[PDB]
């Protein structure tokens, strides 16, 4: 199967640069052109960049023009993206994409999470939520920047899970994520949800343990 | 640089029926015409293509048409696992773009929220802080209305609420309501109460903890 995988988003301050990478696989990636697109957070798609299979052409869009450089290398079957002189506004989820044949996106990569801001990063403090079945929790609080991910028992509990958008407070976002359970399973059991914050290099496991 | 609009922003339908979304284009596009499929946490996924060929991979319940200016994509059977944000493209020419993007909504019956409050944990008293969590998972409707009360008076300030997209099983919404305080109001009264209005039953359902 066709695969990209992204990596190197992060949080940088604006004017600084960033490179983000795209690593093919399952296909003669010099047999296809490649692209780069932005998810802004208002939801809408934004083309950033193409090349050419060979590499011999790439162009961009006005907004990027000149601070953007796209580059692959065949021979590591990798696809890069350079930004430069960034901004607030570019601020955004990026993916790169290839290109078929008629010529269409059929294949994009998982999305690398970039944010432009001059705030500093801000691990979480993570909280336990104890109250036929039942519903445990846990609180991800006053982290920077985004994203977080959140796994129940290191993600041997997966169903019944219900984690929720992150949602800013004064700067800084916050997200609760739940987990429901039959009766039988808790307290008798351990349960605890793992919290990771990449930009801080956090990691953390909080047990649900009952109140008295 | 072409624009594209699609229309209706949002679009809700029931199990079975057929979906129809349209997208207009500003100029020619001779017939570069795609629409693209997001569901949450992932990235776009080509649907169609040249506005008639389906993605490898995509199951005969899509299909678009049109020609000329405006093109449209059609769902039938849809199904359950089908609400999405759905987009169109035009790669006729630089820049390519892409639609403002549609989101697909799917209709069922009414459905209770399944209620939790919890109390804050202990390690967050011990910093000061005092945050009180209530989840309403697995409602529908979406729009529902939550009322926090301290002692029996409602309290405004210090309330985020979050909503996960629609559930891909069961069709459901559930919402996340964080009413956070400091540690000495919290203190200062005892009993905390979580209320879910809704429109299906104007009769409330209630959660509550008494600190004591």
């Known amino acids: 199967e066709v695969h990209l995988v992204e990596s190197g988003g992060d949080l940088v301050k604006p004017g600084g640069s960033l490179k983000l990478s795209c690593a093919a696989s399952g296909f003669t990636f010099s047999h296809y052109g490649m692209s780069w697109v932005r998810q802004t957070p208002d939801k809408r798609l934004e083309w950033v960049a193409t090349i050419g299979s060979r590499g011999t052409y790439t162009h961009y869009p006005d907004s990027v023009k000149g601070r953007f450089t796209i580059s692959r290398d065949n021979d590591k079957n990798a696809l890069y993206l350079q930004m430069n002189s960034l901004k607030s506004e570019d601020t955004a989820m990026y993916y790169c994409?290839?290109?078929?044949?008629?010529?269409?996106?059929?294949?994009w990569g998982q999305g690398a999470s970039v944010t432009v801001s001059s705030a500093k990063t801000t691990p979480p403090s993570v909280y336990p939520l104890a109250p036929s079945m039942v519903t445990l929790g846990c609180l991800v609080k006053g982290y920077f920047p985004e994203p977080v991910t959140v796994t129940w028992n290191s993600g041997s509990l997966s169903s019944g899970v219900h984690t929720f958008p992150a949602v800013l407070q004064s700067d800084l976002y916050t997200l609760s994520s739940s987990v429901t359970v039959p009766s039988s399973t808790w307290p008798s059991e351990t349960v605890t949800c793992n919290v990771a914050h990449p930009a801080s290099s956090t990691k953390v496991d909080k047990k649900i343990v009952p109140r008295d | 640089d072409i624009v594209l609009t699609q229309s209706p922003a949002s679009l809700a339908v029931s199990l079975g029926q057929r979906a129809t979304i349209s997208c207009r284009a500003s100029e020619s596009v001779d017939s570069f015409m795609n629409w693209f499929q997001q569901k949450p946490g992932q990235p776009p996924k080509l649907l169609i293509y040249?506005?008639?060929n389906r993605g490898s991979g995509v199951p005969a319940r899509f299909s678009g048409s049109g020609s000329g200016t405006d093109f449209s994509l059609n769902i039938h059977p849809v199904e359950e696992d089908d609400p999405a944000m759905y987009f169109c493209q035009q790669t006729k020419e630089v820049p390519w773009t892409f639609g403002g993007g549609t989101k697909l909504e799917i209709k069922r019956a009414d459905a209770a929220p399944t209620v939790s409050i919890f109390p804050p944990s202990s390690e967050q008293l011990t910093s000061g802080g005092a945050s009180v969590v209530c989840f309403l998972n697995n409602f529908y409707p979406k729009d529902i209305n939550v009322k926090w009360k301290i002692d029996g008076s409602e309290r405004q300030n210090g309330v985020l609420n979050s909503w996960t997209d629609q559930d891909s099983k069961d069709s459901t919404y559930s919402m996340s309501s964080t009413l956070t305080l400091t540690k000495d109001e919290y203190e200062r009264h005892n009993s905390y109460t979580c209320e879910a209005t809704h429109k299906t039953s104007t009769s409330p359902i209630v959660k509550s903890f008494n600190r004591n």
């Open positions: 040249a506005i008639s």
């Open positions: 994409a290839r290109r078929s044949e008629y010529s269409a996106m059929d294949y």
